[PDB]
Symmetry: none
Subunit: 309 residues, 6 copies
């Protein structure tokens, strides 16, 4: 029984924060895709391939993985950068999909494939080789000794598209907003000028966009997600018989640190670990009730966490 777009988006809210508009798009795209497969297209339809456009560490990869998990469907990643002999490496993505699929052809067709850094292969001011991948990987999108047809499998292509923000503004301008508002005005002709071939873009009808993560968002990322850092470490300290408490001032402190390093959410973990290193070290050697992390423990990194006996 397929989950409605409402249900898919709801389960995406549990793993990904914000990006509500993109999750609406993905929900529909995904739903329609499998809705199409489960009725054998049409007796005697929509490719529904998706194009993720957002900054690095926005959640592009996370969304793809989550979609597959929520639909108990084989999932495999691949990099456009790593892509004549690579034409026989493009089919490699398929064997990997079969590996995680128990070599079940049918389940392999229901699978999802995420290609990262698509904006990197775009030949714009090696070009001849790069375009070669756009056209070689293009043969996959349509669908062709596994014997599996790639027509059935859903393709999700993610990319940062740094220069895309510019080409859009050069078009949308008038006479004389923010990146989020600009990426909404994105059109397939903007991707053309960016470096993507018309035949490739025509194979990616569904276009999703991810907004710039807020500083406050990072704080949410540390708390709200089911696998949020704080929850992960509270679980660790929990099997030690100790309660771990993160003061709001400390969480904000962590976000600020992450912004100063321009590492976004990816740099969150490396900050928390270093802040809890000493504590976890001499933790199994003590006997206290709970440990409370304050701002002074994070930003300054001088004072140790409060210990409650």
């Amino acid at each position: 029984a397929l989950p409605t777009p409402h249900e898919i988006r709801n389960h995406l809210d549990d793993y990904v924060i914000g990006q509500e508009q993109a999750k609406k798009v993905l929900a529909v795209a995904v739903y329609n895709h499998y809705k199409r497969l489960r009725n054998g297209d049409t007796s005697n339809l929509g490719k529904s391939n998706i194009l993720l456009i957002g900054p690095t560490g926005s959640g592009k990869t996370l969304l793809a993985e989550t979609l597959a998990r929520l639909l108990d469907v084989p999932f495999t990643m691949a990099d456009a950068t790593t892509l004549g002999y690579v034409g026989e490496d493009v089919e490699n993505i398929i064997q990997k999909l079969l590996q995680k699929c128990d070599y079940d052809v049918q389940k392999a067709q229901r699978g999802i494939v995420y290609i990262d850094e698509i904006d990197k292969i775009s030949r714009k001011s090696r070009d001849v080789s790069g375009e070669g991948v756009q056209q070689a990987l293009l043969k996959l999108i349509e669908g062709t000794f596994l014997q599996v047809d790639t027509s059935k499998i859903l393709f999700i292509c993610g990319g940062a598209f740094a220069g895309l923000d510019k080409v859009i503004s050069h078009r949308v301008e008038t006479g004389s907003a923010s990146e989020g508002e600009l990426l909404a005005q994105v059109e397939p002709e903007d991707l053309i000028k960016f470096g993507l071939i018309p035949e490739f873009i025509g194979r990616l009808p569904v276009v999703a966009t991810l907004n710039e993560l807020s500083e406050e968002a990072l704080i949410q990322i540390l708390k709200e997600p089911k696998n949020a850092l704080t929850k992960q470490y509270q679980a660790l300290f929990n099997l030690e018989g100790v309660d771990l408490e993160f003061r709001d001032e400390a969480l904000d402190a962590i976000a600020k640190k992450a912004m100063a390093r321009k590492t976004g959410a990816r740099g969150l973990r490396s900050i928390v670990e270093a802040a809890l290193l000493d504590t976890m070290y001499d933790l199994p050697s003590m006997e206290d009730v709970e440990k409370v992390v304050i701002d002074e423990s994070v930003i300054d990194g001088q004072s140790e966490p409060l210990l409650i006996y």
Copy 2:
């Protein structure tokens, strides 16, 4: 009384926009073909070209429309066929195209010989494999001409194809030390050879027409007529939802215009329709209405939402 190429092309200007060079070629090719048939080729023993045609142009340029139109202009039985659907048992499916031509011909052997046959996606069968080529040679037997008892020698063959890679092989030859339109004009039989077509097949397609831009009318037809047309596909999607999906003519035309402005051809049609029906499909399973009507304002402007009838 046969229509002059001047008259033929002139009638092609009414169904097809632009493509003036291709229509001139088709006009002469067609005219010569029937001019040869209506004089019994040549008494005794004299040579005469087959006059078969090879349409080379992007998807939604007017290839198919041109073929259909030609037949209507000459009140001649017309039948289509896809090169992709064409195996050894398909060799007996190649003759199927003939029985279909006879069906629309009222089973009149003579009028069937005057008939026109359009084969789409020829560029697809090019082995560049053992089976695909098998069709090139199996269908090759038709071009020459052999229990209908009808000879396919008389019937005109028009092969349409996009030839995506053809634009490259030509540039690798014509180079020295322009646009696709200028490059496709330099097309030579040897370019199709390297592309995947066998020499014996190309030699059977002497007349080569080339289309450049797209045809607004065909783009509209592509959204409707095809068995797997976008509208029909989405009407099927909305149908298993208990809802009827209606595309107003203004909306379809609106969709074509968008596609032309983006120069993405027919390939860019879907991406336009999807974006227009995104919101609707999202909160569709959560509603309870009879049908949804897509107007022009929903496509071009994309501002208003589709009309909902309960």
Copy 3:
């Protein structure tokens, strides 16, 4: 009853103009090849040449036409192939045998008649792995893979019996020969006559491949006066074909000599040889044929200002 080399050449004169030396070579080569087959080579143990041929001539010189004509004159299954479509594959090794299934198909899958068949490989000069015109490892692979055919090995057919004709332009060949034949301090035709297996070696062909092509035929560059003859003399000459087309229109088509020469000059500047003749004539009569049936005149006269110019329209006589 096999045709003597005399008869073979004579019939080649009806389809090809000039290249007399080449036609004499092909005549002997072809005759000997089948003369060998129709006597079962040699009983017990004896030697016999493979008799495979290597056509060397400019593009549109008649290489292909010669190969085709040879087959028609001997009512023998004929099939073409491009050496370019072969290079760069080990999966093409199973595509090299494809040429055989083609030969069978046109031969009514007849095993013996397929063995009598003729195979023409075009653009052999393109696969040669050499520093000239810089994949090599893959190209040579074909010289050796297709080499397995030349000798002869689920059709069950042996390619030992079938005649192989390999055509090519060999653009750089004219140079390597001159770097050898030179003395201390003529034309391409005279130079291509001095051709030697070692010249092809330096060009890019492997020794084992050349040794399988003993018979070497050389084609001259079609003369402008020859091209003029091609447009007129042949029974299926272009002018005659187009005069026939204009004829069922009730109109007489006249090609002025100044126009025919103009056509030849156009063909030479394009180096397309005779193969480029049609494409020039068509474009010159294009406009005319378009609005021809719409008119009611007596005859149309093609002048030199209509061909090379492509400007002034053909003279119309009412």
Copy 4:
């Protein structure tokens, strides 16, 4: 029963000298990693940054031994410049299984050390080097062994010669030692060094090693439970002879090692050559003890003192 970080560090003190801060870090990272696995969260992957012959490799090996866990090494250099090395990246896995008796579960508990990570960094072949950072990146997360590399601990070692500079260009203020500078290391410093953001984000735990002191080299010859002198004293011991290393001789060995820039790795090769002649004509003699002096090491001219 898992050993506390205290216990892990204690056993590390026995095989490795100094680097107390690094051993504290590794102890935690390791403890947490397995603490996480044994309860069915943080990846806890580690990045060792220290000079050549500082103890990076030794730390990795020791950690595994102390935890009776399958261990395997690999060189990041042998990886770069290939798409066929992507299938060589999984090779590291098959080898981990070989030493694991092909037990999928114990293979997941295993530890993997990648040396010379600083070498693959494409920074001021590049396109190929980065390819490994991302190819080996797929391992870090975890994916016909059927084993998932999500469970296995990854330890990436490197010298990072240029890292000392990029850190100084950031930490500077307006107008200390490498040890103090490597402490100020941040993921953004590695970014500028040539590492991709997605790779560094997979190596959260960062351990920094100091340059082994020349006097530390002397300690390396004495203090460790498996110190060279203790090894050779044992060898000489089952001969009925007592081996005595004079302090002047131990310092002499250290100096030799420094002039050769071979660090601690070059210690053995020096001691062996110094005791080579003695061990040869040892079992043929009958004395009480042999005393190695400086004259026997540096000059190598004089033989070791023999007491009967």
Copy 5:
């Protein structure tokens, strides 16, 4: 049943003329090589052919294989030089050997490999790379085939070799000088010591005499005259080559410096016209005189 060296040399006399010393060496080298393989082993017995271009180096290698019904494959040392990617092209020689071997691992090991123009790779950094890369083959390492069993024959002209030998042997003719060849002479030439040690057996070919070419047209079982006499024979006509004509053919070959390879191209052009109007006549025999070859003016004699 292995053929004795006597027998091997004998069958070599039928395809190659002169070079009797080289054929005795190759005969022993080959015999021992397979005598070793058929008893499960010892010497590598790899061979180094040293002779001018068109002396018969290649022909000797090919003939040896045919006489022993063993897979044979050629290769050019020049196409190898200047690459580390050619290190994976050195294995190509093996896959080719397997191709002609029907992919039979065992028969591929019995195979023979001839590398031409070895003297060309002699150094520079890239060229030496092949000497050491192709060196790994000589010893013998997804075919799974070991190149230890396969016999290697390395041919070369060694233009400068005649000089280095003279600078040493000094205190006759090239033939006498190439006999005094020593591994140290190849060292100074450009070959690495480790490569030469892998080529123990050294065969030296003489420069084919003018008169030798004459023999080349007659003596060999597949001599041109015999081939064309057979061609004219299935026409009912007897073909006779005058001695003055054969000598005339040899001279032509020398003036063109094409050696024996240029023999055919000379005979063909001389008998071209005759073969053209041969099947159209009815005579007893055709005689080829010198006037028909050298001058190419007069037509061959026709006896009815």
Copy 6:
């Protein structure tokens, strides 16, 4: 009763000329290895060096002869193997254990005596994956597969007990060492003495493999005298090889000492060392082997006059 390193080297002097420094290292390494085995390493928990050896010397320097001799002097099962026949396979991982079954074969299938055995791996330098002498992925696979043996794991025999001696020429090693030992702006023998584990690293050997070969012996380029022993003593000595060839012909081949010395001198004059020995013997026996399978005699004797002068033919009985 184990022989002292003194006694071991002394008996090595009877089968090998020169290479005294190498023989001293081998004597100590070997002695220690078995000294450790015969005392069951160490009761409870104590450390002990594996004591595996790495022979580095030119071809025909006696690397193989030293290995074989060591086994004979200690009445211990010995087996050879070529690292070259191993590379390029995962199925060779099951061929790596083959070396063990061969060791058992010569050991009468006695597990214990098999553990005391010695294994010599030749041409180790060949498997090294490096830019020098350009498969790599496959070669390394053996370094790590054979690596599993060094440590020690249907035999049930543990390869931990058996001594491993890996020989190789290491042609490029002489260069990498010079690029390191250099100072600002001697001979190979002096250069190979400066050898370090890091030099083998850059050469193509993995760190984990080298750490398993603690003992490193270096051989010099042999003198003209040693050549005579190389022609006779080694298991696969040329004379034995050709005596075997002549043997399957029903004929006995005898090399007079005067001839053997004659061969050495020839090789010495050409300065090709031991590598040039074969090319000399072949040329001297060429004619004989040619018309040999065609005759019917008892034995052929090679004298000095047949080698040096090359004028007179070998004696036929």
